[PDB]
Amino acid sequence: PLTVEGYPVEGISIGGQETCVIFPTLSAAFDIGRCPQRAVSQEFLFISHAHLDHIGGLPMYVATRGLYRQRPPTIFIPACLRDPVERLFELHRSMDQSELSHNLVPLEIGQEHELRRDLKVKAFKTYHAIPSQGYVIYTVKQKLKPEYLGLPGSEIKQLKLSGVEITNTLTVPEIAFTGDTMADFILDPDNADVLKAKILVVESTFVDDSVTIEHAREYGHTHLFEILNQCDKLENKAILLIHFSARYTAEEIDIAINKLPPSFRSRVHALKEGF
């Protein structure tokens, strides 16, 4: 199984067909594809945009969690999609008489929401043919202050009783997911945290010269050549490339990645499920 910077990664992203990228240790799915069964067990769903290959599985995801008596999921969407997504769920309810319980959380670009005491999300601007946004998940953890770092637990414990503040809150961009986008998201000055996230999940719909950059840009997509051109500004520990055109074989993908300069290439991974 695929693992990136310690995180298992599941799911699939074929450029024409479906995109659902799953981080099961975060209970997170980035887009819903055709509702792969592995996605059903994730409590948090982040929708980048309303193309059917990204959003089409949404009602089935909610319905299946309901059937299995799982906690209603929390679903993050661009704010402008709240209207149609409400309409969608009410239509299905009007037919199938089910509850389709969920928490729908519209986010505008730059807005944040808490997933858990130690986890939060922030939406960021992406550049695509229809309304869209990416998401950065941040860890929010307590870390020992420098002066207490090398200290026996017994000692730490008494400091706790006395009531000393012994930790600092550390907020770190952990996973950044673009969904479909042009490479210009990299140049948007609001996106600095995207470029420092431990893992960047970004589409590279086209990876070799069989397709031209400006053609990639024609449909709101990114060419691997553009990621390379900007690689010096990508401070991510890992880059997970997704959403390759269905025209490609897995071996073509590997070839394209292998051709990258070695220092950058060492940080590059590919989600090849289904290729």
Q: Which residues are near a copy of itself by CB under 8 A?
A: 16-18, 34-35, 37, 50-53, 55-57, 59-60, 63-64, 67, 81, 84-85, 87-88, 91-92, 94-98, 129-130
Q: Output the smallest distance, CB 34 to Zn ion, in A.
A: 12
Chain positions 44 to 63 lying near Zn ion, rule: CB under 5 A, are 51, 53
The residue (of 55 and 268) whose beta carbon lies closer to a copy of itself is 55
HEC letters along 222-249:
CEHHHHHHCHHHCCCCEEEEECECCCCC
**Partner touching 37 among Zn ion, a copy of itself, none, CB below 5 to 8 Å by kind:** a copy of itself
Q: Is 31 in the site for Zn ion (CB under 5 A)?
A: no
Nearest approach in angstroms of CB 84 to a copy of itself is 5
Q: Which does 17 bind (CB under 5 to 8 A by kind): a copy of itself, Zn ion, none?
A: a copy of itself
Q: How many CA atoms lie within 13 A of 260 on its CB side?
A: 25
Distances (CA, A) of 142 to 26, 256, 259: 18, 41, 41
Q: Which does 72 bind (CB under 5 to 8 A by kind): Zn ion, a copy of itself, none?
A: none
Nearer to Zn ion, 10 or 180 (CB): 180
As given in the structure block, the two tokens for residue 219 are 């449909």
The window from 23-31, 62-70, 173-181, 264-272 that contacts Zn ion (CB under 5 A) reads 173-181
Cβ 110 to a copy of itself, closest distance in Å?
Answer: 22
Strand partners, 201: 177, 240
Phi/psi of residue 61, nearest 5 degrees: -60, -50
Beta carbons of 206 and 245 less than 8 angstroms apart: yes
What is the arrangement of strands in the sheet containing 167-177, beginning at the earlier edge strand?
112-116, 119-125, 133-144, 167-177, 199-203, 238-242, 268-270
Length of the chain: 275
> Is 11 or 59 the residue whose CB approaches a copy of itself more closely?
59
To the nearest 10 degrees (0 to 180), the angle between helices 82-96 and 58-67 is: 50
Identify which of residues 94 and 162 has a Cβ nearer to a copy of itself in the complex. Answer: 94
DSSP state of 216: H
Q: Is there binding between residue 18 and Zn ion (CB under 5 A)?
A: no
Work out whether 226 is an interface residue with Zn ion (CB under 5 A): no
Q: Which does 180 bind (CB under 5 to 8 A by kind): a copy of itself, Zn ion, none?
A: Zn ion
Of these, 31, 43, 180, 226, which contacts Zn ion (CB under 5 A)?
180
Closest contact distance (angstroms) between CB of 180 and a copy of itself is: 11
Name the nearest CA neighbour of 202 among 241, 244, 256.
241
Bridge pairing between strands 167-177 and 133-144: antiparallel
Q: How many binding residues for Zn ion (CB under 5 A)? A: 3
List contacts with Zn ion (CB under 5 A). 51, 53, 180
